Amino acid sequence: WGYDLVHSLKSPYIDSSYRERAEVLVSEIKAMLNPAITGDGESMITPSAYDTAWVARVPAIDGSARPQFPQTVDWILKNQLKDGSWGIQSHFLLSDRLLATLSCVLVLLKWNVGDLQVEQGIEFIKSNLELVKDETDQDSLVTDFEIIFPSLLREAQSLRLGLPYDLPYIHLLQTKRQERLAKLSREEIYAVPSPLLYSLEGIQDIVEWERIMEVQSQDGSFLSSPASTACVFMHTGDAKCLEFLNSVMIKFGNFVPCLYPVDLLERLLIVDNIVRLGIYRHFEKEIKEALDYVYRHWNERGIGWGRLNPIADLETTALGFRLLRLHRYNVSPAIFDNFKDAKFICSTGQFNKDVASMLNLYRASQLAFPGENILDEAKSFATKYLREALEKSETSSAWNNKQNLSQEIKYALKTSWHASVPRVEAKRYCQVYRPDYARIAKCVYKLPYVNNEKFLELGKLDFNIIQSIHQEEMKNVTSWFRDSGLPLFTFARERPLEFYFLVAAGTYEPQYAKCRFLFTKVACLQTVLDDMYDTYGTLDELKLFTEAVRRWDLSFTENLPDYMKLCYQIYYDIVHEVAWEAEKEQGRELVSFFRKGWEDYLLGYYEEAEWLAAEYVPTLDEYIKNGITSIGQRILLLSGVLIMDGQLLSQEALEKVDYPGRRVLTELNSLISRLADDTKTYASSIECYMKDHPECTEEEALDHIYSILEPAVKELTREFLKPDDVPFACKKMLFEETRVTMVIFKLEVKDHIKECLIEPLPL
Ligand SMILES: [Cl-]
């Protein structure tokens, strides 16, 4: 590192024009999202050729021999792909094409039209069916393919279409249909809404249409599926079914999607992606509007992808729980009881949906507050589920490989939400986010409001702008450092950038330059004080230094060794500079408060020094007591949090996050830092406990230190997210410093500096 490999950086994105471009992107994104969150253009989703064909089957309600929705037939006739299939051209999935194409072929035949589209579709189905040698070739399956396709193929067979009904793969599908059906409770279908309502068109022989209405959605759909609803309508003539088909046609014009609406899931996927790309600070108003709406529909029974689903959806529910809690809404994890039996279920529907559900459960579980056992249990289950998912052949299908599913899953399992570097996570996500991401349900589909070029464009640009601003700040940091006198203390390693990284990688916003700078000065001072108290420097010297600390008198340093006279002078300057800035920002007297903090820190350290000089091993209690004040995280954290531009902290408000002796944010951070440090390194908490408990072994002692950490981490999360009248930026600054610390204590300190501060994203 050093002055050199820093003043050599040429921050290209520092120019005001880049930030101005970012603001145009922000404004375009707001305009793009408006219909989805405040307008009526919600649920923007691509066509389903398959569902459109089912809707096209509905005969005119006036009894004439034509479709009730002739525009759907027109759509079908006009949207066949070059290869004779129907579907999304950008993404080829066999089961999707197969299903949609046969669906379209059969409806064209019904109305005796599109004779040429029909012979091209048949050719495609027959051609592609013969490329499948075994199962490992079938690729990822759209929802309920094994059930629907054989029965569609039986329909074709009665019409005597030139399809290869005898292929082994076909027989295997019937076998798989028979095995899913065997385990189906038929009586339950009519009483309790289930996932099979999404595909009634595939089990027409089984369903008693006269009893199926008790489980119809309030909007008249069957589990939000147009195909499935169309089918029920053709058997029952039920008016609410028709109203639902009408509302979807009115909305889309001449086609239908495979799910409607998707108002809850879509809103949550937009927020999720904005948050993960690191660009959330530009969209506070939109995120609130999105989540407020989700919250309105949040209920004890969970939520589906749409607000009128008669059953909850784990994917949407787990995603909603996490985002809502993350944004300080009051949500209870008892919500996850809805997905239990007797323990959890899942692993029932189509693969990608199941994996997505467990990924979201895994992530949601990490946001646990104290005493939320159900979340510890959810984590356990999701982990096992996902570990097992990697061992499955489906995970390596051509489709999932194209999207790097296994990578995503592995990354999720090795990634702790608490032990994460926020700037680094955003940078990585900018590298994984796909503007043209395709999802799977009854057919392949996209949500353009969630996955688009603009998100990524802003994601990359905003990241680079922020980073270049930090590069300039690092120039000031290293210039200050070298004229500060601190490099003269050769018994201590120079780490100015490592400390800058610690605050900047979480508290990155441009307005908090001063907070980052002062935090960095204080951490630089501290590393020298640390090495002085525990390594360099005798007890008698330290007793003198500690006395001068009590005596805030520069003139008193005459009694100190030379190296200490200088140390005191630099220390005294830094303390009062921080204090002056804090008084400036806060409008209150704070020099007394800071002096009190520094003396507790350094008196705590002298005590540790005495213990060492005496080969004294404290009890665990007195070690903890001493260690959380002696580690000096508290005075370091105050040196940043009290100088955040525009963030006002009265004494009362400050006491809610900083109060020695209480389990508030600064105390928990101190505690977590001390103990996470001992557990990484291993005069420690381990050895203290083993003195306290002569019979206990080492691994017992360690496990006990973890038994102290895990609850502390949960308390930290609650204190952070808790609604209160403390400026959230302050609370977030304390929390993020803890998270970056937790990353540090789980040669790569430098690798993180490179990724985060040095190298830009390619544009
Ligand atoms: Cl994709």
Short mmCIF file of C-alpha atoms in Angstrom, two decimals, residues 317-619:
data_model
loop_
_atom_site.label_atom_id
_atom_site.label_comp_id
_atom_site.label_asym_id
_atom_site.label_seq_id
_atom_site.Cartn_x
_atom_site.Cartn_y
_atom_site.Cartn_z
CA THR A 317 -43.58 -15.05 2.41
CA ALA A 318 -39.90 -15.60 3.32
CA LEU A 319 -38.82 -12.77 0.99
CA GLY A 320 -41.47 -10.44 2.43
CA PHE A 321 -40.53 -11.28 6.03
CA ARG A 322 -36.87 -10.47 5.40
CA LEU A 323 -37.42 -7.21 3.46
CA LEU A 324 -40.13 -6.00 5.82
CA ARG A 325 -38.04 -6.69 8.92
CA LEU A 326 -34.98 -5.20 7.22
CA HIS A 327 -36.95 -2.00 6.68
CA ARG A 328 -38.09 -1.79 10.30
CA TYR A 329 -41.64 -3.07 9.86
CA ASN A 330 -42.97 -5.16 12.72
CA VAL A 331 -43.27 -8.75 11.50
CA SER A 332 -43.32 -11.99 13.50
CA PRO A 333 -41.58 -15.18 12.37
CA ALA A 334 -44.51 -17.19 13.72
CA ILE A 335 -45.63 -16.57 10.13
CA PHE A 336 -43.51 -19.59 9.21
CA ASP A 337 -45.79 -21.93 11.18
CA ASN A 338 -47.99 -21.89 8.07
CA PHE A 339 -45.40 -24.03 6.28
CA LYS A 340 -45.14 -26.68 8.95
CA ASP A 341 -46.78 -30.09 9.48
CA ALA A 342 -46.92 -32.22 12.68
CA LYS A 343 -41.65 -29.43 11.15
CA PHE A 344 -41.24 -27.88 7.67
CA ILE A 345 -42.38 -29.35 4.33
CA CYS A 346 -41.53 -27.71 0.98
CA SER A 347 -39.75 -29.87 -1.62
CA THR A 348 -43.06 -30.53 -3.37
CA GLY A 349 -43.57 -28.25 -6.40
CA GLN A 350 -41.23 -27.47 -9.29
CA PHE A 351 -37.54 -27.44 -8.57
CA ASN A 352 -36.56 -23.81 -9.13
CA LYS A 353 -39.47 -22.61 -7.06
CA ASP A 354 -38.52 -24.98 -4.23
CA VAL A 355 -34.89 -23.84 -4.27
CA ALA A 356 -35.90 -20.18 -4.41
CA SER A 357 -38.21 -20.72 -1.41
CA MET A 358 -35.47 -22.30 0.68
CA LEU A 359 -32.89 -19.73 -0.35
CA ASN A 360 -35.27 -17.03 0.86
CA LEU A 361 -36.02 -18.97 4.05
CA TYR A 362 -32.28 -19.35 4.68
CA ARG A 363 -31.77 -15.59 4.23
CA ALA A 364 -34.83 -14.66 6.29
CA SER A 365 -33.69 -16.89 9.14
CA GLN A 366 -30.51 -14.86 9.60
CA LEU A 367 -32.52 -11.82 10.75
CA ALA A 368 -33.50 -13.48 14.04
CA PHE A 369 -34.11 -11.54 17.25
CA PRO A 370 -33.52 -13.05 20.74
CA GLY A 371 -35.88 -15.93 21.60
CA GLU A 372 -36.97 -16.57 18.01
CA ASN A 373 -36.36 -20.34 18.07
CA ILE A 374 -38.49 -20.97 14.98
CA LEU A 375 -35.85 -19.09 12.95
CA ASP A 376 -32.93 -21.12 14.31
CA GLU A 377 -34.99 -24.12 13.26
CA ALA A 378 -35.75 -22.64 9.84
CA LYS A 379 -32.04 -21.98 9.25
CA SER A 380 -31.22 -25.57 10.14
CA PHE A 381 -33.78 -26.98 7.73
CA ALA A 382 -33.04 -24.63 4.82
CA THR A 383 -29.30 -25.35 5.14
CA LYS A 384 -29.84 -29.12 5.02
CA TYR A 385 -32.28 -28.71 2.16
CA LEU A 386 -29.83 -26.58 0.17
CA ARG A 387 -26.81 -28.75 0.96
CA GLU A 388 -28.85 -31.59 -0.49
CA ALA A 389 -30.05 -29.61 -3.48
CA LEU A 390 -26.43 -29.37 -4.65
CA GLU A 391 -26.27 -33.17 -4.72
CA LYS A 392 -29.26 -33.43 -7.07
CA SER A 393 -29.00 -33.91 -10.83
CA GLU A 394 -31.64 -31.25 -11.58
CA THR A 395 -29.31 -28.58 -10.21
CA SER A 396 -26.95 -29.31 -13.11
CA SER A 397 -29.57 -29.28 -15.86
CA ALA A 398 -28.58 -27.22 -18.93
CA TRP A 399 -30.96 -24.50 -17.81
CA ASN A 400 -29.73 -24.21 -14.24
CA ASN A 401 -26.12 -24.28 -15.44
CA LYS A 402 -26.87 -21.42 -17.79
CA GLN A 403 -28.00 -19.44 -14.77
CA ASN A 404 -25.30 -20.78 -12.44
CA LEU A 405 -27.72 -22.20 -9.88
CA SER A 406 -25.14 -24.33 -8.03
CA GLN A 407 -22.83 -21.32 -7.77
CA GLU A 408 -25.65 -19.18 -6.38
CA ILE A 409 -26.52 -21.84 -3.80
CA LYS A 410 -22.89 -22.39 -2.78
CA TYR A 411 -22.40 -18.67 -2.41
CA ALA A 412 -25.51 -18.37 -0.29
CA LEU A 413 -24.38 -21.14 2.10
CA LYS A 414 -20.91 -19.72 2.59
CA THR A 415 -22.28 -16.22 3.13
CA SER A 416 -23.40 -14.94 6.51
CA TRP A 417 -25.58 -11.83 6.49
CA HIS A 418 -23.83 -10.67 9.67
CA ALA A 419 -20.33 -11.43 8.34
CA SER A 420 -20.67 -9.43 5.10
CA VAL A 421 -18.96 -6.37 3.58
CA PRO A 422 -21.91 -4.34 2.18
CA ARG A 423 -19.93 -2.46 -0.52
CA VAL A 424 -18.33 -5.72 -1.63
CA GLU A 425 -21.68 -7.57 -1.73
CA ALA A 426 -23.18 -4.87 -3.95
CA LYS A 427 -20.15 -4.98 -6.24
CA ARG A 428 -20.45 -8.75 -6.53
CA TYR A 429 -24.17 -8.58 -7.19
CA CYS A 430 -23.58 -6.08 -9.98
CA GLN A 431 -21.55 -8.86 -11.53
CA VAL A 432 -24.27 -11.52 -11.22
CA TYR A 433 -27.49 -9.56 -11.79
CA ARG A 434 -29.02 -10.36 -15.19
CA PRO A 435 -31.13 -7.80 -17.08
CA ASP A 436 -32.67 -10.62 -19.12
CA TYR A 437 -33.18 -13.16 -16.29
CA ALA A 438 -35.84 -15.76 -17.11
CA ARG A 439 -38.02 -17.43 -14.46
CA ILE A 440 -39.96 -20.70 -14.54
CA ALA A 441 -43.58 -21.40 -13.68
CA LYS A 442 -46.20 -22.98 -15.99
CA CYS A 443 -43.99 -21.45 -18.70
CA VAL A 444 -40.74 -19.50 -18.94
CA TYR A 445 -41.38 -15.85 -18.12
CA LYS A 446 -39.72 -12.52 -17.32
CA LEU A 447 -40.56 -9.58 -15.09
CA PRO A 448 -39.16 -6.47 -16.86
CA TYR A 449 -39.64 -4.28 -13.78
CA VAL A 450 -37.32 -6.56 -11.79
CA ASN A 451 -34.79 -7.49 -14.44
CA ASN A 452 -33.72 -4.72 -16.86
CA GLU A 453 -30.69 -2.85 -18.25
CA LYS A 454 -31.29 0.36 -16.27
CA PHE A 455 -30.91 -1.25 -12.83
CA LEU A 456 -27.52 -2.67 -13.74
CA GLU A 457 -26.38 0.48 -15.53
CA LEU A 458 -27.06 2.54 -12.42
CA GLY A 459 -25.67 -0.20 -10.21
CA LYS A 460 -22.29 -0.16 -11.91
CA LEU A 461 -22.08 3.60 -12.30
CA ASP A 462 -23.14 4.40 -8.73
CA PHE A 463 -20.64 1.90 -7.39
CA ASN A 464 -17.80 3.45 -9.38
CA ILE A 465 -18.70 7.00 -8.42
CA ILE A 466 -18.79 6.10 -4.72
CA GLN A 467 -15.50 4.27 -5.01
CA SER A 468 -13.70 7.13 -6.77
CA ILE A 469 -14.92 9.50 -4.08
CA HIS A 470 -13.40 7.14 -1.53
CA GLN A 471 -10.16 7.08 -3.50
CA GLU A 472 -9.87 10.82 -3.09
CA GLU A 473 -10.56 10.47 0.61
CA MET A 474 -7.83 7.86 0.91
CA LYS A 475 -5.42 10.39 -0.52
CA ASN A 476 -6.29 12.75 2.32
CA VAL A 477 -6.03 9.92 4.85
CA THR A 478 -2.53 8.88 3.81
CA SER A 479 -1.33 12.49 3.52
CA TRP A 480 -2.65 13.22 6.99
CA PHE A 481 -1.12 10.01 8.33
CA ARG A 482 2.38 10.73 7.15
CA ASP A 483 2.47 14.24 8.67
CA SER A 484 0.75 13.07 11.86
CA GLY A 485 3.79 11.65 13.64
CA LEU A 486 2.21 8.20 14.01
CA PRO A 487 4.64 6.52 11.60
CA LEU A 488 7.42 7.35 14.08
CA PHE A 489 6.15 4.62 16.41
CA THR A 490 8.00 1.84 14.65
CA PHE A 491 6.91 -0.77 17.20
CA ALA A 492 3.46 -0.61 15.58
CA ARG A 493 2.38 -1.52 12.05
CA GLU A 494 1.01 1.27 9.84
CA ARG A 495 -2.52 0.36 8.72
CA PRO A 496 -4.32 3.56 7.77
CA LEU A 497 -6.18 2.05 4.78
CA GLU A 498 -7.21 -1.06 6.72
CA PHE A 499 -8.95 1.17 9.22
CA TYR A 500 -10.39 3.39 6.48
CA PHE A 501 -11.78 0.21 4.87
CA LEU A 502 -13.42 -0.82 8.14
CA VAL A 503 -15.74 2.20 8.16
CA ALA A 504 -15.93 3.07 4.45
CA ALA A 505 -16.95 -0.40 3.30
CA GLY A 506 -20.19 -0.06 5.24
CA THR A 507 -20.73 3.67 5.77
CA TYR A 508 -19.97 4.73 2.19
CA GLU A 509 -22.34 7.66 1.52
CA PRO A 510 -20.63 10.84 0.15
CA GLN A 511 -21.98 13.14 2.89
CA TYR A 512 -20.21 11.13 5.65
CA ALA A 513 -16.64 11.98 4.58
CA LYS A 514 -15.86 13.57 7.92
CA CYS A 515 -17.20 10.56 9.89
CA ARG A 516 -14.94 8.21 7.90
CA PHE A 517 -11.91 10.51 8.28
CA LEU A 518 -12.13 10.98 12.06
CA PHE A 519 -12.93 7.30 12.58
CA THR A 520 -9.75 6.52 10.66
CA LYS A 521 -7.60 8.91 12.72
CA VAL A 522 -8.83 7.46 15.97
CA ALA A 523 -8.28 3.86 14.83
CA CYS A 524 -4.72 4.75 13.75
CA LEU A 525 -4.00 6.28 17.13
CA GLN A 526 -5.47 3.23 18.86
CA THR A 527 -3.30 0.65 17.10
CA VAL A 528 -0.27 2.51 18.45
CA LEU A 529 -1.80 2.76 21.93
CA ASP A 530 -2.58 -0.96 21.84
CA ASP A 531 0.94 -2.06 20.92
CA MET A 532 2.24 0.34 23.56
CA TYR A 533 0.10 -1.04 26.36
CA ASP A 534 0.57 -4.76 25.72
CA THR A 535 3.98 -5.10 23.99
CA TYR A 536 6.30 -2.09 23.90
CA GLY A 537 6.47 -0.13 27.13
CA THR A 538 7.04 -1.19 30.71
CA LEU A 539 4.49 -1.18 33.50
CA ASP A 540 6.23 1.77 35.15
CA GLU A 541 6.13 3.77 31.88
CA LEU A 542 2.48 2.82 31.36
CA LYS A 543 1.66 3.94 34.89
CA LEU A 544 3.09 7.36 34.04
CA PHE A 545 1.24 7.49 30.75
CA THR A 546 -2.01 6.47 32.40
CA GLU A 547 -1.62 9.20 35.02
CA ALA A 548 -1.18 11.81 32.29
CA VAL A 549 -4.37 10.44 30.76
CA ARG A 550 -6.21 11.34 33.97
CA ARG A 551 -4.41 14.71 33.89
CA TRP A 552 -5.46 16.36 30.65
CA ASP A 553 -2.39 18.58 30.92
CA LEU A 554 0.10 18.89 28.08
CA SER A 555 2.58 20.47 30.47
CA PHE A 556 2.56 17.29 32.56
CA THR A 557 4.23 15.22 29.83
CA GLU A 558 7.63 16.51 31.00
CA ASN A 559 7.76 13.42 33.26
CA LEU A 560 7.18 10.98 30.40
CA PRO A 561 9.78 9.13 28.29
CA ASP A 562 10.38 10.84 24.96
CA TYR A 563 8.38 8.42 22.86
CA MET A 564 5.47 8.89 25.24
CA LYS A 565 5.68 12.71 25.26
CA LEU A 566 5.05 12.55 21.56
CA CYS A 567 2.38 9.88 21.87
CA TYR A 568 0.50 11.97 24.41
CA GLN A 569 0.67 15.06 22.23
CA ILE A 570 -0.73 13.29 19.15
CA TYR A 571 -3.40 11.61 21.28
CA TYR A 572 -4.36 14.91 22.85
CA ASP A 573 -4.67 16.60 19.43
CA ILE A 574 -6.78 13.81 17.92
CA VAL A 575 -9.16 13.67 20.92
CA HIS A 576 -9.87 17.41 20.78
CA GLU A 577 -10.15 17.59 17.02
CA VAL A 578 -12.76 14.83 17.13
CA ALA A 579 -14.45 16.61 20.00
CA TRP A 580 -14.48 19.97 18.22
CA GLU A 581 -16.04 18.40 15.09
CA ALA A 582 -18.61 16.62 17.24
CA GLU A 583 -19.55 19.81 19.07
CA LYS A 584 -19.83 21.50 15.70
CA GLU A 585 -22.13 18.84 14.34
CA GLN A 586 -24.17 18.39 17.54
CA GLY A 587 -24.52 21.91 19.00
CA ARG A 588 -23.85 20.54 22.50
CA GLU A 589 -20.78 20.40 24.78
CA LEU A 590 -19.00 17.04 24.27
CA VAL A 591 -15.36 17.42 25.28
CA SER A 592 -16.14 16.16 28.80
CA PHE A 593 -18.01 13.15 27.41
CA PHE A 594 -15.12 12.24 25.07
CA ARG A 595 -12.48 12.64 27.75
CA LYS A 596 -14.56 10.30 29.94
CA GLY A 597 -14.62 7.73 27.16
CA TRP A 598 -10.88 7.89 26.50
CA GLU A 599 -9.98 7.55 30.15
CA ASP A 600 -12.26 4.51 30.65
CA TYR A 601 -10.60 2.94 27.61
CA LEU A 602 -7.01 3.65 28.68
CA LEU A 603 -7.60 2.93 32.38
CA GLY A 604 -9.12 -0.38 31.31
CA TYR A 605 -5.96 -1.01 29.32
CA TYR A 606 -3.63 -0.16 32.22
CA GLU A 607 -5.55 -2.74 34.26
CA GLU A 608 -4.93 -5.34 31.55
CA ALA A 609 -1.28 -4.30 31.63
CA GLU A 610 -1.17 -4.86 35.40
CA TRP A 611 -2.73 -8.28 34.96
CA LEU A 612 -0.04 -9.20 32.45
CA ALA A 613 2.86 -7.92 34.54
CA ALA A 614 1.54 -10.14 37.34
CA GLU A 615 0.75 -13.26 35.31
CA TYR A 616 -2.79 -12.89 36.63
CA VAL A 617 -5.57 -14.79 34.90
CA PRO A 618 -8.94 -13.17 35.56
CA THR A 619 -12.25 -14.96 35.93
#
